[PDB]
Design a binder for this molecule. Sequence first.
Ligand SMILES: CC(C)(C)NC(=O)[C@@H](c1c(C(=O)O)[nH]c2cc(Cl)ccc12)N(C=O)Cc1cc(F)c(F)c(F)c1
Length: 97
Amino acid sequence: MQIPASEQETLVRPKPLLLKLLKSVGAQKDTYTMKEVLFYLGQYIMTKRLYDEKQQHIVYCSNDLLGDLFGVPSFSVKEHRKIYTMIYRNLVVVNQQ
Ligand SMILES: CC(C)(C)NC(=O)[C@@H](c1c(C(=O)O)[nH]c2cc(Cl)ccc12)N(C=O)Cc1cc(F)c(F)c(F)c1
């Protein structure tokens, strides 16, 4: 639940499945900052109503594309590093020159 600000601005290119997910919720770019990826994934979770209705800080992503991407049935929204790691496996970090 704490990512350095420098890492939040890291430029990334999502792989096809994550890209298609992001474009369904209003994102149109092919290159993002991690800050942008996290925002649009949070919007996707809201749109697909994947957050726990009982408000116990858990996303239920089983049998949804997000669960396919993350490789988990569910996860805690309080564990930012583990969420970043799951997202990192679905993108390429843009090389800096
Ligand atoms: C589940 C709902 C919809 C209620 N959203 C959240 O609670 C959630 C959130 C956001 C956001 O705000 O935009 N974007 C996400 C993407 C995913 Cl996969 C999961 C959770 C979130 N969150 C907010 O505090 C926690 C959070 C904020 C960050 F900044 C992070 F890096 C992080 F790992 C976790």
